[PDB]
Amino acid sequence: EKRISEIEDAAFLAREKAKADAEYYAAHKYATSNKHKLTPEYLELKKYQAIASN
């Protein structure tokens, strides 16, 4: 069972690295998309919607 746990650690470490890189790439494309979408008018619209939501 200790050997099995070592194998599980080897597998889990790689899986978490893949999830880290997938989130890193998504954030970078979100970040570079914000520079166009996040304008004063879009922020004003979001402000209105959030303030008046409930």
């Binding site: 069972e1 050997r3 194998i7 599980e8």
Partner: peptide, 16 residues
């Protein structure tokens, strides 16, 4: 049985 289990987990690592 536990040799079989070790082999199973190696294959599971490949699948992962």
């Amino acid at each position: 049985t536990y040799g079989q289990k070790v082999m199973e987990k190696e294959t599971e690592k490949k699948i992962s």
